[PDB]
Amino acid sequence: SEIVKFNPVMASGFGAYIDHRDFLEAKTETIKNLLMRQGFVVVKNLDIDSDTFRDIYSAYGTIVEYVGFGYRDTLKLEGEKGKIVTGRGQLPFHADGGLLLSQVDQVFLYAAEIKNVKFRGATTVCDHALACQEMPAHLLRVLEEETFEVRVLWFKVPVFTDLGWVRKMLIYFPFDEGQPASWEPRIVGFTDHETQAFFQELGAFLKQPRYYYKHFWEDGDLLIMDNRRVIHEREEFNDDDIVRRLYRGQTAD
Amino acid sequence: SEIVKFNPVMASGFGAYIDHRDFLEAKTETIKNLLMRQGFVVVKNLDIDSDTFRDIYSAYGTIVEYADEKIGVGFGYRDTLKLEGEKGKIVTGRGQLPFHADGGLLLSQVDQVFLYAAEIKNVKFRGATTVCDHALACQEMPAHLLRVLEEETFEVRVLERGYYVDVSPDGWFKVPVFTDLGWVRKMLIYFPFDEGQPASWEPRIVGFTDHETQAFFQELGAFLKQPRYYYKHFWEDGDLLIMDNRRVIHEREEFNDDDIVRRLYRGQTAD
Amino acid sequence: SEIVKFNPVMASGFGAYIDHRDFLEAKTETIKNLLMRQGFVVVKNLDIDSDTFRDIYSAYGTIVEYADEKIGVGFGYRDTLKLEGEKGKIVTGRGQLPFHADGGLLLSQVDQVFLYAAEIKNVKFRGATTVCDHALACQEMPAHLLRVLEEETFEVRVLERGYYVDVSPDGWFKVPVFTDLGWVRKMLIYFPFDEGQPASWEPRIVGFTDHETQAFFQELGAFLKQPRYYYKHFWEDGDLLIMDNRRVIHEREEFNDDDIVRRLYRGQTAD
Amino acid sequence: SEIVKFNPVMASGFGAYIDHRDFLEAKTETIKNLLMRQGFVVVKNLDIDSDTFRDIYSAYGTIVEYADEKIGVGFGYRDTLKLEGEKGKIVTGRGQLPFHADGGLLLSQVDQVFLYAAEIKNVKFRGATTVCDHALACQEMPAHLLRVLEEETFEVRVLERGYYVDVSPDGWFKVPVFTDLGWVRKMLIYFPFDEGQPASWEPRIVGFTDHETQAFFQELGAFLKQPRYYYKHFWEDGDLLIMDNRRVIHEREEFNDDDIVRRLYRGQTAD
Amino acid sequence: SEIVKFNPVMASGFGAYIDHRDFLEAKTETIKNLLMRQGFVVVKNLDIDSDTFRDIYSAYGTIVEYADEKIGVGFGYRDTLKLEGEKGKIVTGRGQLPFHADGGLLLSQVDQVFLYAAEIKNVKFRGATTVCDHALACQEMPAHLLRVLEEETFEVRVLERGYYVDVSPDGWFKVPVFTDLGWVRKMLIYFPFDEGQPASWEPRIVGFTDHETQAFFQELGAFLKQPRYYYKHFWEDGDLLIMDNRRVIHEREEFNDDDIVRRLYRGQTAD
Amino acid sequence: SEIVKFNPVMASGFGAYIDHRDFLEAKTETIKNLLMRQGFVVVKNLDIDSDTFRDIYSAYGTIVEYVGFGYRDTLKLEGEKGKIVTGRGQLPFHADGGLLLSQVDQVFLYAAEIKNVKFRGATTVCDHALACQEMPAHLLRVLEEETFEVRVLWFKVPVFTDLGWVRKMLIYFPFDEGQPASWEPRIVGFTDHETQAFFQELGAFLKQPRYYYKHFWEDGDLLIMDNRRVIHEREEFNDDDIVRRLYRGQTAD
């Protein structure tokens, strides 16, 4: 049972900054373990190609393809115009994957190339377990008792999947007006007014600095998330001068 | 001197969730006492009618009622006010009621306020009754806000003439912000209605311009609405919410959707 | 309803330091009110004699006094007790008085207690009067301690017969730990004297062995003595310490050095 | 996933009080899940015999039991251990069991530990079972204490030969303090017994002197016993305490009074 | 070393309220010292003319003044600047002055800044001078905001040419955000003016777009304005506000109401 | 104005752990600055001889000799039997140096050789500024208003010297019974009983983990303190098997 050197990201003690050399030398298991309780790992100054990226993430478990024969492993998020996920707009709060064979345990994001962007296109991370514990009861009640449905632009998405150590969160926040949308949420028995108001209020609570981390990208950055322990978002970068190229990997057990 | 089981509502330890059986079996004095320090009580799944509701609340003191020459108040409800979201009404209407304490505008002492949900339909995230821990808020408030509350003169004018008849004063009258009862400084304050919400009353601050008064209420409002001090009650059939009117202030949030059914019964007591 | 300037004593906001001019100019009601929520008041550099001391405290309510058939209590002090560190005495002696509330053992209601330092000499770090914020302590206390206080039967027996005469009961008698006044649960508790300190009274807990009772009081004691709840007043000439007897409990620490001069005047009021 | 209603035990939010009816109606998986994050569950007012106790705990996984070859372990209890304060025994005796995790000394994995109060008499403030939130404590621990736990080699020797027979290793053997399970670093540690308490086991730290090890454990113990991390359970008939043995460590405090009746049932499960 | 009596302004312990008599009797060095750790001092009820104001502030070090060659700076004030809300001016105008430190744009070192209220009329909730505890804020700041402050190049351009004449550099020039003095990282930063407010200066960040810079300042401003770091001073006649310009940054909020009289004296000193 | 990478030692944010390479590469001024607000610096794995130790510390200002001609620079604290300061017993809470020309601004301690000790002979550091701010008023009153005198085994030692950014503390706690003592404190107008009780109570408050750091020594450890910002203590190591050899340097401006 080995230890890796890290520093917490949040004041709560959540998250982990790891030096690139310490990360590279650590056993896969050591990082996989730390991620479960720290939620996310931030590594800077990591000069690697796409093949090394795959060598790194594939060791964490079975690759989740984005039938499959193992080829759709690394997703290139390069801000392609006319796309949503691989596009240039917002991705509101969500977790990756779904249930059963489509579940995702770990998500890896690596910055291949970043140019002309300093305060847009952040990837954000929310400590949902701590947030749900400290949340006003009227917000937590909705998450725990009401049926959340989603339509791809209706099916039930169970908000909480109790794994004991965490309640894995699956949720899909609405896109901001003006943003190209791939999904639309609703809450059974709530009006449009009520659902809009709920997501606005919940979104504001989840974005408080105690729970919320904003990662602004630099070449060689690696962001790893335990997809069961955090939820995440991409902020818009809709300027054509911006170059933002990330590689995405996903693993599960 | 007896004890009732309860769970705190607020992270601070303020408020009281009480199981309906525990509430019903408790002596009136036990609940009346707890309210002084806990500010408010929340009971769910209480199955009672209006007569039993009165039996419960009347035991807490002298019923605050408007009869004889005062029969005009609240359109002649006498004791138990029916808040049923009626069109063309404000207090008993479908819009917001901003932060207030009961009784003040009618120059009546109100110690306890009781709200029971007779019927709630097609509303999940509107029409909340909200509760503020003002003692703790005043203790932790930025000095420039507390100063205004402690030192400046607040005046109110009523606007819903059908509700207040001639029991309320005619024009602008002074409402003392704090009344020192020792164990608490009872707060009597009357916030401005949001733009677009029909206004039952209207506040001003002497020596302040309209620009300053608006800015002050909005800033104070945002402070008081922080989760540390602020509880939002979303109504279900059989909910009972009791407030110590000296220890908390409260609001109703708008429910201006025609499909909503929201009928509450309201009782008031004082000593 | 009027305001007195003060600074909190405790980091929690509890307690009140009041400048002597501000205290003297304030109405009795202003101070009486503040005590209910602040628990205690500290005034320094007050230059008064015993007659003026009585003029001040008697305004707070009905003087708790022992005359006629009760003239035996406290060796015939009647109203203002002189605590002057007399040999062969306990309450008015030179040793510890463990955590207690006033009045309880004599079956008298005491709301406010006043202590004025007439003369203090050759003491800088002994002979403190200490004050505990019991409401906050009970709120934050470990459950296994609070349970005992709320559920078990506490009994006391007096030992200083010359002080309590026949006004106190003869043997062991029940003292209710909490009396619910709503705004506070008034605490009546009587801690055991430390080994080596002459004992004016003695507690027991029904159903507990001597081993368990000793362990409980020591553990509770250490909890109550934490800085968050606990204020230590080291006396200087002209100090006035006022306590709301329903809102705090207090102790005196030993001053068993013959060179020490420690003379306090004590008044008590109730409604 | 189903939700069981509970209230936190610790101010931090750790631990779970669950109503006996809510507990009985809950799916095993619901409680088993909750235990991983809450560390321990406290249920009062259960009325169950030894067979029903077994039916409840056995559903949580594979029963940790010692039969056939390992029949000597625990003086032949097999599955449910009866801790009844037997004279001349230690684990099932009347003395202290210092901070520990179950199973480790027998080289058995134990995930959940169950303790039910069959009979308790003449004890109110002794014989407690205590629980430590070790994950929070390690996170907030002074660095000089955590360093020892993370970097030094901890060895243990089994002393109560009748309890551990030949299943436990002979002489000193290394027990790893932390085992990283990702969601938690499982703690395996075996504190030294107080002087005067019969010792079932004995710890040492390689490279440390006897006084360094004694000093370390004394200081670490005091830190872990702070109320932020520490819960004391005083037993009553029908109490059920469940612990996730990976998430908390626990102790028994002595009850060496002849009049005390203290009989607990113990079950253990693992996956 | 002498001690001046004071009360903290912020809940954190930062800032100092000092009684006017205590202030006047205090040695200059005592106040000068206290300011380094308390950031700012607030004195009320001073009755002083402009000459006495100068005598007080000039004792704190070398007067930061602009005479002879630099006589054009501040429209020829020399030592004491009169901020009297003059139309067609900005610094001495009636609008907002956003978060800043004094001196930096003129390339002058300023250690202490003094502000005295000569005359204030018809203003109760506008025209505040505000103070930010930047050391605490930077320590608790979200990492994405602090990174910009520590790593990016901040440039400023002077716009109110009449105020800064030829002493300020022409066009865009780099201003270092942090200057490490050991005891503090002195902050030099110049926030953008709100739209509708006449701008005395203008910031940019090298490599940032206009909307990135605007977005950064909006978010940073909101964080710094949290009551934990932020004090709002609403002026009355005889108020004195002193700031250590190395330890805090400050702003003026608009007072663009014609009826408002707001005349402040300003002094600056450095070593 | 340059920055050095560090991690806080205390949960309050006080103190600084610095990696040995980062420390060696940092400018003297950068460390000297950080020490003023962080109180103390901890560096591990520093393999240097006595001459390099001197090269390092002498750059911080004027060397304070332990008349002088500059030769008594590095004090060797090697646990010599029959000595106090360079002995094997306790040194209770104190700051180094005195006033005027004998003042000490920075104290450096380096572990040349450490053997047979794991839980004795710690050097401890107290955040006195934070402690004085949060202290019960009855404790702070004594420190602020009463005269403290010391006798070498009577002269006034001013408790607080107000430097603005800090109140520099000079104080000399009594030695524990059984420990060889080089000084003895008293408080004017307090009895022996009262003074003993005060130091006991104050000592307990100052040793709470919020304010108090314990450094257990390893070969190559360097502990630097800003002597104006912290007070410190040595815990006994009175076992003859223990090897504890520290080099001490002191600088002032």
Ligand SMILES: O=C(O)[C@@H]1CC[C@H]2CC(=O)N21
């Ligand atoms: O108590 C009342 O009946 C009325 C309704 C609005 C509330 C506030 C006040 O004075 N009253």
Ligand SMILES: O=C(O)[C@@H]1CC[C@H]2CC(=O)N21
């Ligand atoms: O109030 C009293 O006179 C007495 C003295 C001790 C105190 C506690 C109590 O019942 N009394």
Ligand SMILES: O=C(O)[C@@H]1CC[C@H]2CC(=O)N21
């Ligand atoms: O799990 C067990 O049966 C035994 C009893 C003592 C406890 C600690 C340990 O290894 N065991």
Ligand SMILES: O=C(O)[C@@H]1CC[C@H]2CC(=O)N21
């Ligand atoms: O210090 C000054 O006189 C000028 C006025 C505005 C303030 C900010 C700055 O560089 N100055």
Ligand SMILES: O=C(O)CCC(=O)C(=O)O
């Ligand atoms: O582009 C990013 O920052 C993350 C994209 C993402 O969340 C996803 O691919 O699911």
Ligand SMILES: O=C(O)CCC(=O)C(=O)O
């Ligand atoms: O309808 C409600 O929520 C409460 C209305 C109210 O506050 C009142 O009756 O004064």
Ligand SMILES: O=C(O)CCC(=O)C(=O)O
């Ligand atoms: O002497 C004192 O400090 C107070 C004595 C006391 O508590 C009492 O009079 O009951």
Ligand SMILES: O=C(O)CCC(=O)C(=O)O
């Ligand atoms: O008796 C108890 O309180 C629990 C004993 C125990 O921990 C064990 O049997 O291992």
Ligand SMILES: O=C(O)CCC(=O)C(=O)O
């Ligand atoms: O008018 C004020 O409030 C202060 C103005 C100011 O900061 C300045 O003159 O630089």
Ligand SMILES: O=C(O)CCC(=O)C(=O)O
């Ligand atoms: O030996 C140590 O740990 C420090 C000694 C010390 O404090 C000193 O020399 O002044």
Ligand SMILES: [Fe+2]
């Ligand atoms: Fe995603």
Ligand SMILES: [Fe+2]
């Ligand atoms: Fe109301």
Ligand SMILES: [Fe+2]
């Ligand atoms: Fe008393």
Ligand SMILES: [Fe+2]
């Ligand atoms: Fe056990």
Ligand SMILES: [Fe+2]
């Ligand atoms: Fe300025």
Ligand SMILES: [Fe+2]
């Ligand atoms: Fe030293």
